[PDB]
Amino acid sequence: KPKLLYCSNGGHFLRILPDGTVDGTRDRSDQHIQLQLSAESVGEVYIKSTETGQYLAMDTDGLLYGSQTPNEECLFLERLEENHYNTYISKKHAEKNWFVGLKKNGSCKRGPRTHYGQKAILFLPLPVS
């Protein structure tokens, strides 16, 4: 089943627009916030927009963007945090410890500006319903 990824930080939902853009919206009713989480290997996943077929991927500069094709930049390490929040780490830049995160305003928080402990890197997976 598809999910909604909520960021405790601004109380935003992870969104990927068809223009490749990735930000956060508070509108639980937006079509571009439903994603399908795919397990590639163990602890690894693919995050995909059910609407556009876009994959969430992270550039070399730590910027989030939507990808038309599944690739290296699209895998993330899924971590279940003790508080029952999830964290996602770019697999390509794991050694850098670059996370998926959103500012409080809902803007994408760049991978190297993120860090463990931040509220911007804690997501909660919700039912679309």
Side-chain angles (χ1 to χ4, degrees), residues 2-30 32-128:
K3 271 116 207 316
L4 302 182
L5 300 174
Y6 171 95
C7 191
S8 40
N9 190 35
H12 295 104
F13 299 114
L14 193 89
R15 181 178 76 172
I16 317 202
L17 308 152
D19 67 9
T21 301
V22 185
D23 62 358
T25 193
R26 274 183 251 197
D27 186 356
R28 176 149 218 223
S29 89
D30 170 309
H32 306 99
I33 51 162
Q34 333 187 11
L35 331 127
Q36 143 220 304
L37 281 88
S38 253
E40 244 0 85
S41 130
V42 141
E44 307 185 319
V45 308
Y46 268 138
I47 294 124
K48 117 140 135 59
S49 175
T50 70
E51 229 45 51
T52 56
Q54 274 169 91
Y55 289 87
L56 170 84
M58 187 191 263
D59 65 16
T60 47
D61 296 357
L63 220 353
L64 295 168
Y65 67 89
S67 156
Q68 336 179 12
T69 89
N71 81 5
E72 307 165 19
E73 315 203 321
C74 303
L75 288 151
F76 298 94
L77 300 189
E78 196 192 53
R79 239 206 137 162
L80 166 90
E81 303 296 331
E82 287 166 319
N83 50 40
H84 298 260
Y85 273 96
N86 285 205
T87 71
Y88 301 91
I89 293 77
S90 131
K91 158 144 159 218
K92 201 199 176 209
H93 305 280
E95 181 173 40
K96 307 102 175 295
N97 298 136
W98 292 6
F99 291 85
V100 173
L102 302 168
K103 286 167 273 167
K104 294 150 164 255
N105 61 0
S107 315
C108 163
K109 175 161 193 171
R110 288 164 167 163
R113 286 319 292 236
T114 66
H115 185 284
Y116 203 46
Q118 287 177 16
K119 356 183 89 243
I121 71 160
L122 304 157
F123 291 93
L124 189 83
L126 294 165
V128 160

